[PDB]
Design a protein around this ligand. Sequence first.
Ligand SMILES: CCC(=C(c1ccc(O)cc1)c1ccc(O)cc1)c1cccc(Nc2ccccc2)c1
Ligand SMILES: CCC(=C(c1ccc(O)cc1)c1ccc(O)cc1)c1cccc(Nc2ccccc2)c1
Lengths: 230, 235, 9, 9
Amino acid sequence: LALSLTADQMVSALLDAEPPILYSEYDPTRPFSEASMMGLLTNLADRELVHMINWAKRVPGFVDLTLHDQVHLLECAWLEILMIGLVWRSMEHPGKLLFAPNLLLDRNQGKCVEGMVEIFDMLLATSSRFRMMNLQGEEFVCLKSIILLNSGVYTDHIHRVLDKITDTLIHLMAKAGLTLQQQHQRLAQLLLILSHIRHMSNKGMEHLYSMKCNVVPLSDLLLEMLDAHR
Amino acid sequence: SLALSLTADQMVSALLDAEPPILYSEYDPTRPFSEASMMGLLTNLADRELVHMINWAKRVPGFVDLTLHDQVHLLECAWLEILMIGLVWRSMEHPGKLLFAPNLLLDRNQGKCVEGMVEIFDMLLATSSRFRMMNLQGEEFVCLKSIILLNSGVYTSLEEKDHIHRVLDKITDTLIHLMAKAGLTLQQQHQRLAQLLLILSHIRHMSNKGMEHLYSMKCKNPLSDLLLEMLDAHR
Amino acid sequence: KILHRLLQD
Amino acid sequence: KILHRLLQD
Ligand SMILES: CCC(=C(c1ccc(O)cc1)c1ccc(O)cc1)c1cccc(Nc2ccccc2)c1
Ligand SMILES: CCC(=C(c1ccc(O)cc1)c1ccc(O)cc1)c1cccc(Nc2ccccc2)c1
């Protein structure tokens, strides 16, 4: 059903499935301690997960998978998906991370949690990278969908859907008036950033099950998604 | 510089010319396989491979134009990724097996012997299968390997940021040039290009997972000096 | 797991 | 640092 969709239809379907931007708890009480900061982020991420799971079901070709495959992909990609969203939100705020409209953080506030600042820098670098090449929203939703389907596929139909989003990405660039060379160059630039998003996810994940070893209580769901990475 | 001047066929030639040899292991098939010994074998192999990779990176266009500090940073970040894609490339025509060396060819069964390796094993195996169905060409492989070297550490005043991207762009042009020569249509060239680059996200993943226990394996167990320094760079 | 429920819901 | 040296010498 996803294969029969057109590129303009693909974009519209993805843009319409976009999860909302949630707000942090309105304490706010500043500066933070490492416990309070991790609390706000954990609480936020847990609420984002519920919206992500529903955003995923509305990704073309995702409901066509077995319930096993849907679970595996989400378990593999959830932090990547959270991060690219964070990065996307933070584009218009150079040097800042926009976790929530009422929660904007700079690098220095990253030092609150025992680095953290290392991941902050990687996230800030990714956001600036997007800002530099003027990443469009239609491009963003395609990238986030690619992350969902690709990140756990090496662990047919999925690669078929993946090719479609590639077709969609090219379409957007041909629309913007880019030359054939500029299209595959920009496409390459976008996809290579995914390797860095993966890296940030792995580094972030590694610290998440080292926080569990009891700074902030994690939700049962956030623990499940965390256990899926051993 | 100089790397901006090369044509597609020129960089293919230069990259193919720079290819490191496939090293042998000290594997004695007249012995069983313990976890400690096998890991010692792969460690010894990786250490000797590192020396060839360092001198290979120098022959990668644009890499010598970067500062010594940045060259170090790129290699520290991508060395295991480069070892892994090379391993996966060697194992393309060996279904269900990984060819660490011509005298060392192991399947998933003998991969269990190391605790917490079978998962990587399956990931590397799936990657090799992925390359197999794509019928990945050697010309495309050396391009991907150069990309990993230049891309992996680039996100971690400095003109230099952009020069690397300019090289990456030229490498993209080369892959497209190769696919067009293969007769593929434009839609096919774009899809295949995407397919190859998405694999690099998995190679990154395998590297992180692999790196993760190398510095847990460091506690206890048998690592060389250069390997310890490059392992230090990650945690 | 919890993830199963949220997917079917 | 060995890597730095080999990248030189
Ligand atoms: C900034 C990304 C954030 C996640 C996030 C949250 C909300 C978003 O919209 C996007 C990303 C995150 C934070 C807490 C969670 O429980 C889950 C994810 C995150 C992810 C992993 C780790 C950390 N903190 C950390 C890092 C290193 C050492 C010690 C601690 C932070
Ligand atoms: C199979 C890849 C191999 C490496 C390799 C070697 C040669 C190549 O050409 C390519 C990859 C590798 C093994 C040991 C090293 O010190 C470095 C790399 C490697 C790398 C990292 C981890 C593991 N297994 C492991 C170790 C400890 C605990 C749990 C799992 C294996």
